[PDB]
Amino acid sequence: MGHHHHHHGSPEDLSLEEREELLDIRRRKKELIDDIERLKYEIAEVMTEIDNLTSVEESKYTQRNAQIAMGRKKFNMDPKKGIQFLIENDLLQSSPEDVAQFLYKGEGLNKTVIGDYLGERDDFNIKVLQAFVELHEFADLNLVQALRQFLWSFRLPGEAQKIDRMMEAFASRYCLCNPGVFQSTDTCYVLSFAIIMLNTSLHNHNVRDKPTAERFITMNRGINEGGDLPEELLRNLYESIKNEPFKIPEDDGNDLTYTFFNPDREGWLLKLGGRVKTWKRRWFILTDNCLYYFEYTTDKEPRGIIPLENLSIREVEDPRKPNCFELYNPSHKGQVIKACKTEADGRVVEGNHVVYRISAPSPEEKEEWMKSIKASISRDPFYDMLATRKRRIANKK
Amino acid sequence: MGHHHHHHGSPEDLSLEEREELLDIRRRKKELIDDIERLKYEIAEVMTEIDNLTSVEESKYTQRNAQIAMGRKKFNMDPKKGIQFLIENDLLQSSPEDVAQFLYKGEGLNKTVIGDYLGERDDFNIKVLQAFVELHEFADLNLVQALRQFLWSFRLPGEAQKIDRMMEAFASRYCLCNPGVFQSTDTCYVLSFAIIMLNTSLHNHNVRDKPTAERFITMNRGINEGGDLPEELLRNLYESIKNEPFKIPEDDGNDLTYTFFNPDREGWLLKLGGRVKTWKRRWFILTDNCLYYFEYTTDKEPRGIIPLENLSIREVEDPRKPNCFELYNPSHKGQVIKACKTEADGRVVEGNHVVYRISAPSPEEKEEWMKSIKASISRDPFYDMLATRKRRIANKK
Ligand SMILES: O=P(O)(O)O[C@H]1[C@H](O)[C@@H](OP(=O)(O)O)[C@H](OP(=O)(O)O)[C@@H](OP(=O)(O)O)[C@H]1O
Ligand SMILES: O=P(O)(O)O[C@H]1[C@H](O)[C@@H](OP(=O)(O)O)[C@H](OP(=O)(O)O)[C@@H](OP(=O)(O)O)[C@H]1O
């Protein structure tokens, strides 16, 4: 167009050849500088070699390296003994901060053992855990970003009490680094486990219900001490996890972050009677590691309650009913399972079941129920830990 | 056995080949630098070719200001290297007095870096330090006022030997400026640290019990080479610090003047006897790596004295008493601990203890005493240096 000041060319303007040459020269100079730096480093190394360092003349590895290597192996066998060895032999200073730096570096250390050690209730270990989380720089990171760093540094212990200590230290550190984001440490803690469950949900194929961004927003309603967190904040967390699962060190495929299942379920099932083997359709609620069943969805009181403590599942083929499994106690063959139910007259009595045979409406519902029940049983101490924590999260109005 | 931290050596340097290699590397580096310079020249030529001088460009370039700024930048990263750059660029003269004036003005200089440089043991640095203190006028100022002035000029280094050199230089200067105020340099030095400790005690919220003027006065009994300083002088110093904490430049909230804590302890505990296994309530005082115990808080004469050198402490189970710990000699198992105590007849005799078992009224107090005793045993180099000066402050030679 007849105008002025308009290139109407490419996205870039015209370059001049001399300028390009100058740029190339600058690059060359930079390379030369780098080379010089490398040479200087080499010279320094040579000087160190020249210098008298105490050791013996023939040596495959050196004194410091050899001693630290054995100390790391000692740590992996028994963290308390390893730390002690390193301190005694002046390979590591005695303060919680120095020990924490050693653990954070984590060179040649088993990260499961790191987790076992940091999760101990001893006063020294508690102080190391504090310094350990202080080595994680959480300022200006969203909660997932901080979790990614933290969960690279160690492997979560199996003991519910130990998991609690470490996630409490994490949540407290996050909130101090990011003040005003969450109303309480409890909020941060519970949301953290919501993120961990979402990781399992979205990335483990054994989980069929893949929550949407909107669904995850709804699930965390009232988490902020009764209030709701910003929808944008929850979306960023959801999308980060969706895009990339938690990367776990020394991953055995058995990690909590990958196998944190929802232990709760509701729905219709048929159940076979105890002494009298009649099939009845009942509304079932799995909650608090118990299977509650009701005659009608509108009933206030359950028809019966089956504690899942000490039970396991076996699939069975039934002559009449499809998609069957049994709950049974593998330790007490032929013995009645501890449970309660209501008779026709309203009397609450003990159940007469050696086994509970259950039939699901579809193969898919069978698999869902067995997963939920197994999950509920297998991680009960941990779900209990979260439940007692969530109660203090809810506020009383 | 144990090996000494600093080792002695005989001058030997069999690394002729290595040295030669280093020299070769240096030569290569020099060549690289020359090449870089050539490249820069070429770039300049290219720039000239690019530019057409219709006139000359008016952008103020100032080589002298650039060198000044460069020198400061260098100093703040490495004080020795910044000072050498300024000298080579004719912006600073090379005498200790000239370097001292440069640091004393400290224009755009990091005050922590100034302290790092002044504290060094080098012959040149020692001379700079003396000239640096000479540029401070302490005449007609009291010790707090002189300390306010001095502590504006630099930040105290962390190392005990460096602090000592700087505070010795200060105390010497103060006493020359104000003759007759203190009977010795030692008196001035120790009182300076009493003032610093007071600043910490009054102004650091971590110190619970704030000293009164009268506590500060009595704490300093005998400091003037065996005699007391004027009551009103000590009161004036106390009142000045109480009214205004030391103002520290570039303060990070972790300055020595704010964190100079008193580790000495006192309290009632129950102790088990030696030959005769009776439990006695005794008033304990821990100071200068020794545990004293008394019948009454008002006694000057202790019931016993237990030097902590060569001892260790461990928590112990007792059949009857809770919250117990034990002093024992880790290196000589079963050996009687060197101590003295008084008998009912007034004799002083050696103790008969292989261990000193002591019961605290709470688990918390047991933990506190153990921590304090362990800290005493591990020692603190600067606490010890102050202790030494306090011992030399003496009435008669
Ligand atoms: O209703 P009828 O055909 O008489 O049979 C009943 C139902 O199957 C009960 O199920 P529900 O309680 O769900 O109604 C069952 O109790 P369980 O709940 O213990 O299975 C009874 O077991 P016994 O009481 O053990 O015979 C059985 O007698
Ligand atoms: O008071 P009685 O019951 O006679 O028993 C005394 C006290 O326990 C003493 O403690 P204290 O000195 O605090 O009064 C102790 O001295 P230690 O202070 O050395 O423990 C004596 O130890 P032996 O002297 O070793 O028996 C012990 O005989």
Author numbering:
A (entry chain B), B (entry chain A): 3 to 399
What wording appears in the published article?
Cytohesins comprise a metazoan Arf GEF family with four mammalian paralogs (Grp1, ARNO, and cytohesins-1/4) that function in receptor signaling, endocytic trafficking, and cell adhesion/migration (Chardin et al., 1996, Fuss et al., 2006, Hafner et al., 2006, Hickman et al., 2018, Ito et al., 2018, Kolanus et al., 1996, Li et al., 2012, Mohanan et al., 2018, Ogasawara et al., 2000, Rafiq et al., 2017). All cytohesins share a common architecture comprised of a heptad repeat coiled coil (CC) domain, the Sec7 domain, and a pleckstrin-homology (PH) domain. The PH domain binds phosphatidyl inositol 3,4,5-trisphosphate (PIP3) and/or phosphatidyl inositol 4,5-bisphosphate (PIP2) (Chardin et al., 1996, Kavran et al., 1998, Klarlund et al., 1997), with affinities, specificities and spatiotemporal distributions dependent on splice variation in the phosphoinositide-binding pocket (Cronin et al., 2004, Klarlund et al., 2000, Ratcliffe et al., 2018). Two autoinhibitory elements, the Sec7-PH linker and C-terminal helix/polybasic region (CtH/PBR), strongly suppress GEF activity by occluding the active site in the Sec7 domain (DiNitto et al., 2007).
To address these issues and gain additional insight, the structural organization and extent of conformational variability of Grp114-399 dimers was independently investigated by single-particle NS-EM. Unsupervised reference-free classification of ∼10,000 manually picked particles from 500 micrographs yielded 53 good quality classes representing ∼6,500 particles. Attempts to generate a 3D reconstruction with visually selected particle classes were unsuccessful, suggesting potential conformational heterogeneity. To explore this possibility, the 2D class averages were systematically compared with 3D volume projections over the range of possible views for each model in the MultiFoXS pools. The 2D analysis suggested that conformational similarity of best scoring models might improve selection of classes for 3D reconstruction. For two class sets corresponding to compact or intermediate best scoring models, 3D volumes could be built and refined. Automated docking of the MultiFoXS pools with the refined 3D volumes selected best scoring models having relatively compact conformations similar to the more compact models in the six-state MultiFoXS ensembles. The low resolution of ∼53 Å for the refined 3D volumes likely reflects conformational heterogeneity in addition to negative staining. Flexibility in the CC-Sec7 linker is the main source of conformational variability, with a secondary contribution from hinge conformers that does not appear to be strongly influenced by dimerization. Although the analyses are most consistent with an antiparallel CC topology, the resolution is not sufficient to definitively exclude parallel or mixed topologies.
